[PDB]
Amino acid sequence: GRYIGPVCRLCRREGVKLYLKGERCYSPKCAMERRPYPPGQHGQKRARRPSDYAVRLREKQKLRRIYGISERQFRNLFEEASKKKGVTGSVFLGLLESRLDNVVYRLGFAVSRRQARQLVRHGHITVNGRRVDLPSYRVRPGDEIAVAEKSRNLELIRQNLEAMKGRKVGPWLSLDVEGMKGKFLRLPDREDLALPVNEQLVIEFYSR
Amino acid sequence: MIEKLRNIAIIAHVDHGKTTLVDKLLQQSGTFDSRAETQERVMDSNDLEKERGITILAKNTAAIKWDYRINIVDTPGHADFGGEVERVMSMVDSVLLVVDAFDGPMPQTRFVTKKAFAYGLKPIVVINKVDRPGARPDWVVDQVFDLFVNLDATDEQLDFAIVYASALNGIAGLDHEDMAEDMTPLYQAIVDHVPAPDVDLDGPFQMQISQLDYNSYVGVIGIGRIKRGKVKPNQQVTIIDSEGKTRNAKVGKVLGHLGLERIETDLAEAGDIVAITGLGELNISDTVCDTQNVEALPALSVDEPTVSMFFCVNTSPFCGKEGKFVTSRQILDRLNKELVHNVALRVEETEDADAFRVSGRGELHLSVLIENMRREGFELAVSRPKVIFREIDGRKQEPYENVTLDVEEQHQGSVMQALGERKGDLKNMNPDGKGRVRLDYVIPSRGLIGFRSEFMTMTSGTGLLYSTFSHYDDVRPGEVGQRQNGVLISNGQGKAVAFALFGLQDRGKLFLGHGAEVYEGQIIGIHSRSNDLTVNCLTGKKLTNMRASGADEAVVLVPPIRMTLEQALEFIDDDELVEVTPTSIRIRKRHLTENDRRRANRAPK
Amino acid sequence: MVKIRLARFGSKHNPHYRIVVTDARRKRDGKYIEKIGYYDPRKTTPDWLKVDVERARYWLSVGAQPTDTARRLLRQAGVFRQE
Amino acid sequence: RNLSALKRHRQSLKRRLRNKAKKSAIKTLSKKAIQLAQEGKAEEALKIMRKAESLIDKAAKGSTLHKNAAARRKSRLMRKVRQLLEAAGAPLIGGGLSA
Amino acid sequence: TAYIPGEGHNLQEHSVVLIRGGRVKDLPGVRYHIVRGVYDAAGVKDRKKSRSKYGTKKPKEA
RNA sequence: UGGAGAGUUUGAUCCUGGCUCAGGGUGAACGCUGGCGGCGUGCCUAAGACAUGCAAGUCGUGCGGGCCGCGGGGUUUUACUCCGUGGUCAGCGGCGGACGGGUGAGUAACGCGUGGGUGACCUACCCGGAAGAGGGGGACAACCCGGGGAAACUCGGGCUAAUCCCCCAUGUGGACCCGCCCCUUGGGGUGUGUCCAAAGGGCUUUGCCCGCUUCCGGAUGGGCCCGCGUCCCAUCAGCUAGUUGGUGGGGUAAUGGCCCACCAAGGCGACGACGGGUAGCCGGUCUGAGAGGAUGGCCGGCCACAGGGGCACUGAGACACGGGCCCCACUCCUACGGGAGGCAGCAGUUAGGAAUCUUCCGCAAUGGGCGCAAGCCUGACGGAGCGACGCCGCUUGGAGGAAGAAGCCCUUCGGGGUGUAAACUCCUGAACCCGGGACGAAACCCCCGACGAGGGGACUGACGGUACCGGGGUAAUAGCGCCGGCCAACUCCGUGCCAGCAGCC
């Protein structure tokens, strides 16, 4: 499956807060906090050299990782950006995002990429028209979705749609905490995506 | 429909009219001519005609008519493999003991009826050969009446049944003095005397595929008696011991010699569904039937006979060789393949990767498997799995278990000799007022081998006794044979030379001939004494001339002395693996090279 | 015979058909004397059929015989309204 | 192990019988003809040329002569009637062969 | 000739098994080799890590 | 809109070159794991051999018949014909068996791709036009009789139908010779002569419909031909008698040495000829930044064989998979004389090997063959099963829960580690349960109206009661390779040139 296991263990692994578990691996405890260093039996072992490889692979890697979606598929879309004119670096970055699942989280609805994907498969999705559960299903030229029917009612629905009702999203994500509904605009673009990384690093890494 | 099935078996033995019973009755069963034997049954049944039973169906009337079935063993032996017929008590509702009016019954038959004596199934006496002259029929009836008077039946008594039969199809019967003909009363002496095995007029399918086989197309054959439900998958099924199972295909009953998938099964009869589950695999132990609801079904029931012939690989020098299967791999494939059909066979794993403890039933039983191995193309030695001297400081701590074999005080002095001569300590000879008398001789696995053979030659079949162990000993201090008249071994590979085998020829007997070119370790006759030697010759030397002539001399030489197997195997004692082949049978010592033998002996101390 | 019949295009459980012409010899899918309109009975597209009326006719001209279901499809099309 | 179709065969029997028979026919008579022309019996040679022409086509009818079968047949025929009958002898009943 | 890998073994003349082939420098002519479990030849008993090659299913850690 | 380099031959240096390695791809196998599904997907070796069960028939609007049922007598009954008819079974008479299904042995070739060619052609089941359809005869099966054989089959006699065969009219034509004019290698009109046309059937019937003959024609499908392009070895040099061509000549739908007689003898070759080795060509496909490598099954197209070898008739069309004659090997049967078999078709067997499924349901959809239609035939197809054999999607879980367990790992024993990892709370909610349930299909047919246009009616899906939707509903599988450098990933112990690992170093 889409990986599983002690992941704030990864919090430690890569560093750049893999708080990513969603909340506390996000506040006072998870490499992002606590022994911030690379975990392991030798995590506190003064590192060594970074093969230009260590480099590219590293970036490519945590990158893919923090999104909970197949390495294969990943590379796939990549290609797409590659075989679909336009700095594939960008195009892809975008594609990365535009994924349903990706979005499931992206819009506060979800608090972690994982719970996000989860819900996605589990229903409570409001595709433009009733719904879809493919924590994959891209997000066509910015569409609408949200706490589907019989969903606007689950305790966690609450936790979320509820504690939520506040903050704003990005320049490509339309947050309507109202009738719990999110709507996409257009290709997110470099800038509007915090999440530090680069691109080149990773694509070259691929080059063959 | 199940209240008309009548499946019975026609016990037998060393003689005299196997089937005979099953066959001939055709009248009845068949078109016209010819053959009418075989009969029936089976494949390579020339020299003899045992093993490979099944089944005796045919919708033959008589008329009478029907009963029905007419669908039971039907099984001789001369068993080989000791029991086998066991799969008969798991269906048959009566036995057809076919004795001879010339001498009566044979010890060989003193089992087929015994193993089921504690029944259960009123045997059906059948005196044959009465068509001849010398063969009192009234006297035989009296003798066959004491077979129970001392063992009970109890309702036998009857034991009536009580037939004589006749060559020209009498058969009597009934009994005396010409039946008809004889193809109109025998039927009555069965039906009217045969009941309808308690079958479940309804419920699920309870067919216990006792036996089982396979065909180069007709897949695997079920083979067994239906206990409940029947019968047209699929409609999966269920197996015993394990799940059993997915589903099923068809089912070829026993209409006489097929093959033909029973249009509709139910019970009583001895149907054998197929197709489901592809005959994968087969174990006359489970109890196929409906989908659970619910296990289980009996019985096992019994197969553990005795005997043991260690197996190995002809890792000798002569190459290479028999056909294409001499290594271990090829052999193994055969071993397991036998642990399927065989019911009286017990394959065991020893120490030597090239050794096996083939535990069969009778001394001859193991032969059937060996004889069939050659014709298939696979040379192997016999037995020959020895024991281990432990444990361990030490001197052979094996076990010791003896058992009398009545007796009939006509062997009390013929059996006490061997045992007493082989250390066979008679821990106790439980006697009785009847006439026989048990004799438990704590014998070890070292003094038990081959014993089964000679034993059957002492009491003449009428003598059974097994063992096991009482406590690991140390072998004592004496050798348990070790056989008399040392075995003549060779001194190298080459060929038999008249001038070589001529010299030392009066020093006993010879095996091979000429130019017979054997090798080292291979035996070529027995010594006039107990000592062993390793002569040689080819050479036969020497040629030639001139000069000159003309006289004289022209030594000849006698030939085997050859055989049997069967007549050479039991000849061993220490380590003379009877290397057999799909067209030949040799016998060499565990150590070919002479000087090599001394390495292991090496005696004290 | 020279006929206008269809072929199946799609996959597993999906069969649109090629409204085409060929000689009743080349497998329902064999090459085809020529392509002419397409149609799908499961529906989906609002555009579940395009049976070129003209070609229908022209071809039709000399002997063009059509599957029966063919003929009905084309007439429907409106290549068969004798007005 | 049974299949009606054999019919075919049997027919071949019938048909083939016939057709040959005829083919023979035209062959042989055409020949005979060729001969008359040869000897010089112009007149009769022609008559033949006739019965000929006739049967050739009769063949035409079915599957014995075909396409241009009968064609060459005739062409050959008449050209010959003439050539043969060209030892100075007059196209007597020059019917079958026009002016 | 080919290499008999796998720590422990057996197989006498009359022993099948097989070669997945594999040169094995340090002993010329070993242009191929066997593969534990092939028909006859069993597997590296009492083994633990890396086992597909030197074939041996995983142990129920019991 | 797209090309990354590392190892490796010294005491260290620079170079040529050899070899090693990375990644990419496959109708793979094997090791080890195996939860759902979807779709592509499935002998690439014995192209050996195969039990068995389906794989092509369909028409009484074609024809006589036999057997069967109904109704109806007939005749008193005797009898058993004859009718009407539902039919059944062949026989006969037509139209399909030449695609549809298989595989690639053979094949170095216009066989193939490609582009042209045909004054040397031919296509029945359809549309186009014009003309025709009027007398006479007759067969062999069916049946009965007769006979040989085990069978196979079967030889001799006797009568009968037809859209079968044959003769005679009528030619709009057509064919041929020959004749001419126009052309232009055997294309077009026509003139004198000769030869050839042709079946009915059924009904609301005097005509409505299936159909029939002659010819010009269309769409169509194919045939022969021709350019260029289509693999290695020259330690394969010299190759050639129908062989180079010519006269005429026979065959064929027509060419042509395709087969013949004569006659002249040239004809071929390094712009590689003769030979040998390899081989189904391609459209296309993996590959590579790239020209270029390789490959070319499952689609699709053209090509060849059908156990191997040969042939020919039936014919619009074959030398013909499930057709026929003859030899080789094979295999089976017998009364030994004598007969039957070819699954490189669907499923399926055994042998081979590393190896490759199912002896399924369904003709409801498409599709194809006979049918005036009703419909009949249809392991083409439509699915269906089974295989990690590939490709796509999906899951065994989310979330909060300690300076932080137990425990095992390291430990300079201070501590460090695996680890929020697990335990816990809420949670969601796969598998699995109840209810409903699909397009997929609308045509051929009813009724209207010229049976036509158009129109309204009628009927029918094995995938499935699954798919799907709804409500239900527990939290539910992980592993496999690597860890000296190339390369990313570190420590304890054993171990101590035994054991061993290696692509290289």
Ligand SMILES: Nc1nc2c(ncn2[C@@H]2O[C@H](COP(=O)(O)OP(=O)(O)CP(=O)(O)O)[C@@H](O)[C@H]2O)c(=O)[nH]1
């Ligand atoms: N005259 C005569 N001969 C007989 C009769 N029964 C058997 N035989 C002969 O004796 C021989 C033995 O009979 P058979 O039944 O074949 O032996 P079996 O019992 O089947 C084999 P086994 O004795 O091992 O059980 C046969 O070859 C047969 O010819 C009989 O009733 N009359």
